[PDB]
Amino acid sequence: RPNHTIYINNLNEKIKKDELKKSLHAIFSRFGQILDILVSRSLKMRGQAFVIFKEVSSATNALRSMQGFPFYDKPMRIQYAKTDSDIIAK
RNA sequence: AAGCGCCAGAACU
RNA sequence: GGCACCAUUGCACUCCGGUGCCAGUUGACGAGGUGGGGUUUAUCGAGAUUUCGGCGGAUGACUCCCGGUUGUUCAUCACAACCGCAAGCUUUUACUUAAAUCAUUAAGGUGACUUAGUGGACAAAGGUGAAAGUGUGAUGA
Ligand SMILES: N[C@@H]1[C@@H](O)[C@H](O)[C@@H](COP(=O)(O)O)O[C@@H]1O
Ligand SMILES: [Mg+2]
Ligand SMILES: [Mg+2]
Ligand SMILES: [Mg+2]
Numbered sequence: 001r002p003n004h005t006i007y008i009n010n011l012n013e014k015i016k017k018d019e020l021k022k023s024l025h026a027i028f029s030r031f032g033q034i035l036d037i038l039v040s041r042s043l044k045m046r047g048q049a050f051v052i053f054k055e056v057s058s059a060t061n062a063l064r065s066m067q068g069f070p071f072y073d074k075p076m077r078i079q080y081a082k083t084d085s086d087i088i089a090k
Numbered sequence: 091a092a093g094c095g096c097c098a099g100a101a102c103u
Numbered sequence: 104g105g106c107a108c109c110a111u112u113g114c115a116c117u118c119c120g121g122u123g124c125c126a127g128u129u130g131a132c133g134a135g136g137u138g139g140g141g142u143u144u145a146u147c148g149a150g151a152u153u154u155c156g157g158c159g160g161a162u163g164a165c166u167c168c169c170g171g172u173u174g175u176u177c178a179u180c181a182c183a184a185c186c187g188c189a190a191g192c193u194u195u196u197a198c199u200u201a202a203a204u205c206a207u208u209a210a211g212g213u214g215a216c217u218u219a220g221u222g223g224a225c226a227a228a229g230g231u232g233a234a235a236g237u238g239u240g241a242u243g244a
């Protein structure tokens with residue numbers, strides 16, 4: 001079911017936190033207001049990102065339009081996030 | 091304006 | 104913090120795989136101190152994760168040398184203890200802005216941390232200027 005946060009994986013894990021953040025912002029801010037982008041390079045979480053849209057409608061067009069889009073040489077996979085970001089529940 | 095300077099170990103990022 | 108490799112396709116919201124290599128960062132808080140040669144593990148305390156470990160300095164210490172003080176004028180020689188522009192020993196007296204830690208709040212840095220301000224303390228050694236005692240003989244004016 002649709003969500004404010006879209007889950008992105010298959011991201012190039014050689015890209016550092018700061019850069020991948022901004023690049024993601026560069027690519028995804030046309031869909032709507034991005035509240036935060038969450039990114040970590042740990043064993044569990046590397047190659048993955050959470051983009052938190054203010055409006056779900058924006059998240060939907062994001063997932064739809066950028067699905068499989070080559071980014072740092074790898075086509076990204078995008079999913080509606082399992083749970084809400086706590087910052088969206090708050 | 092000399093318990094002062096440096097930084098190869100160590101620890102920390 | 105960064106890079107290569109190995110491994111990882113992983114659904115999170117206080118960071119969080121391993122190895123190697125590079126980078127960065129921490130690494131002494133003040134007080135005190137220099138005649139020359141030598142030797143050597145270079146004085147005082149405050150603090151308390153490294154103020155540890157390594158390297159390099161260094162005014163210390165001991166000893167030798169040289170030049171001087173005191174041992175009641177004043178030379179000369181030894182003797183006893185000192186001094187390096189000070190100067191026997193006992194033995195009281197004030198002076199010699201401690202600084203950091205600690206607390207606190209700004210700036211910078213991705214970060215480890217860094218710089219600076221603010222607040223209040225608390226030393227020891229050595230030294231310096233007073234004060235009371237108790238330290239030579241030989242020869243010559
Ligand atoms: N004042 C100190 C000395 O007392 C100390 O001996 C010397 C070497 O210190 P360390 O051996 O700890 O490096 O440094 C300073 O000069
Ligand atoms: Mg210092
Ligand atoms: Mg000093
Ligand atoms: Mg040391």
Ligand SMILES: [Mg+2]
């Ligand atoms: Mg040393």
